[PDB]
Amino acid sequence: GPGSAGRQEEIAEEVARLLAGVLYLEPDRLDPEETFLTLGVDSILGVEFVAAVNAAYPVGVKATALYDHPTPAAFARHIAESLGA
Numbered sequence: 579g580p581g582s583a584g585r586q587e588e589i590a591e592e593v594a595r596l597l598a599g600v601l602y603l604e605p606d607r608l609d610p611e612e613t614f615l616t617l618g619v620d621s622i623l624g625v626e627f628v629a630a631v632n633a634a635y636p637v638g639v640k641a642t643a644l645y646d647h648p649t650p651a652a653f654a655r656h657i658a659e660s661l662g663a
Contacts, residue, residue, distance in 0.1 A: 585663045589635070590654035596634065597650055600627040610651045614644060635661065 590610055598605045601618050608617055614624070624644035632639060637660040647653040 585661075586655060586658040589658045589661070589663075590651050592634065593631070593650045593654040593657070596630055597627050600630065608650075610654075611649060613648045614650070615648075617650070619644065631657070637661070 594608055594610045595605050597617070598608045600623050601608075603618065619627075621641070621644075625641045628639060628641045628644060631637070635657050637657050639657065639660070643653055643656060647656060
């Protein structure tokens with residue numbers, strides 16, 4: 579709830595902005611609570627987005643995180659716990 583507010587949300591909004599450009603979509607069409615499957619991700623688009631994430635955030639995260647997390651918000655919570663929010 580509201581007591582959990584912070585940089586976890588800013589990292590999730592930046593992920594939601596940068597992903598939509600790999601899927602050839604717009605961030606006005608994407609929602610951060612919806613899954614990578616309904617957003618139109620497949621394994622190649624996963625690897626391409628993860629290569630762009632590792633240039634914006636020094637986490638060292640692999641394309642297995644796009645299989646292990648269902649949503650851009652769940653994936654961004656991993657980044658935010660790696661940076662310490």
